[PDB]
Amino acid sequence: DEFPIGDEQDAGILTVAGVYFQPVDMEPAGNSLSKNEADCHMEADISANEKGATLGYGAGDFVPYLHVKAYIQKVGSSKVQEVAFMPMNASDGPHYGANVKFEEGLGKYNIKFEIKAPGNDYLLHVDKETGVTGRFWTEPIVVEWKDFEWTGPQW
Amino acid sequence: GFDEFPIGDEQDAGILTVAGVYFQPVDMEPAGNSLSKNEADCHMEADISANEKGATLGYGAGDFVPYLHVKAYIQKVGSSKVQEVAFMPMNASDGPHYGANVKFEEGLGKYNIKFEIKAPGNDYLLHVDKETGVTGRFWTEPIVVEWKDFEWTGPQW
Numbered sequence: 001d002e003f004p005i006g007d008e009q010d011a012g013i014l015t016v017a018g019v020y021f022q023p024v025d026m027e028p029a030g031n032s033l034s035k036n037e038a039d040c041h042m043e044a045d046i047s048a049n050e051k052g053a054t055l056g057y058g059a060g061d062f063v064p065y066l067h068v069k070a071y072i073q074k075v076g077s078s079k080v081q082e083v084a085f086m087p088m089n090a091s092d093g094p095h096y097g098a099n100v101k102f103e104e105g106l107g108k109y110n111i112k113f114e115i116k117a118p119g120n121d122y123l124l125h126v127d128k129e130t131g132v133t134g135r136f137w138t139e140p141i142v143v144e145w146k147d148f149e150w151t152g153p154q155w
Numbered sequence: 156g157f158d159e160f161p162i163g164d165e166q167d168a169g170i171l172t173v174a175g176v177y178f179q180p181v182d183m184e185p186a187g188n189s190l191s192k193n194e195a196d197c198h199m200e201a202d203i204s205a206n207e208k209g210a211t212l213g214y215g216a217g218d219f220v221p222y223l224h225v226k227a228y229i230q231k232v233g234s235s236k237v238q239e240v241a242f243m244p245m246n247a248s249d250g251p252h253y254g255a256n257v258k259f260e261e262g263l264g265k266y267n268i269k270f271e272i273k274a275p276g277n278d279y280l281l282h283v284d285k286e287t288g289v290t291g292r293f294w295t296e297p298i299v300v301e302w303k304d305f306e307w308t309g310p311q312w
């Protein structure tokens with residue numbers, strides 16, 4: 001069903017897995033390509049690790065209200081494709097994802113996920129009685145997988 | 156880790172399990188839409204999670220349901236005045252919830268408290284293909300949960 005982009009990675013309070021599988025139909029359609037126009041669905045599985053308790057997250061919890069963008073670059077190429085992910089549910093639960101088309105065809109790509117904190121959408125209790133001790137990250141978190149091979153559908 | 160006071164009993168509505176609590180007003184960063192700590196009577200919280208029926212939408216039982224739009228309507232019983240207060244999603248030491256600092260504008264006594272829970276709309280997508288998708292669908296009109304004759308008795312803190 002699901003194919004890893006690479007090994008799972010910890011970054012700050014986040015645990016970030018990247019997977020891909022067949023392109024999907026989404027309701028509403030969102031920002032990404034239609035199923036027939038796409039090569040795959042790409043998905044960032046983002047959850048809190050143990051350090052997330054500093055912001056009030058339980059370990060393993062989905063972290064919502066993030067802003068996630070993927071950068072897809074053919075190795076040796078002068079151009080990078082930028083793809084906004086949206087939050088969504090599949091049968092396997094919440095994630096950030098998008099239908100994606102590899103613009104340079106089958107080959108070796110570098111894949112980066114850029115993960116921005118919630119900002120003014122999501123609040124934090126900061127008082128001592130009920131509050132958390134941590135604060136959201138200010139610089140976007142970057143997870144990168146080198147030498148991902150896109151070899152067409154595996155489904 | 157801190158004292159929480161009940162608004163009635165936990166209620167199920169659609170795929171949601173909804174409980175209300177309140178406690179001392181809090182400091183929020185950023186401040187959001189609601190009253191400041193020193194201007195409010197309490198912090199009011201809606202704890203919204205998926206029940207067993209939430210699996211139809213791909214939610215795990217008990218998990219927080221994000222991207223909802225939650226508003227509270229607070230009406231003193233016998234009064235025509237209805238206060239409306241938007242809740243925002245946020246984390247406290249006990250985890251995610253929707254909440255706001257609120258003021259009971261008509262003083263001590265009986266209030267009807269309604270939580271109006273709008274579905275995410277264009278903010279949250281659903282896979283709907285057969286292979287990876289879900290067969291449940293979000294609600295067009297808000298889910299409403301109400302506790303009648305909640306008693307505001309003043310701060311214990």
Ligand SMILES: [Cu+2]
Binds near residue numbers: 041089090282
């Ligand atoms: Cu998806």
Ligand SMILES: [Cu+2]
Binds near residue numbers: 125200247253254255
């Ligand atoms: Cu709160």
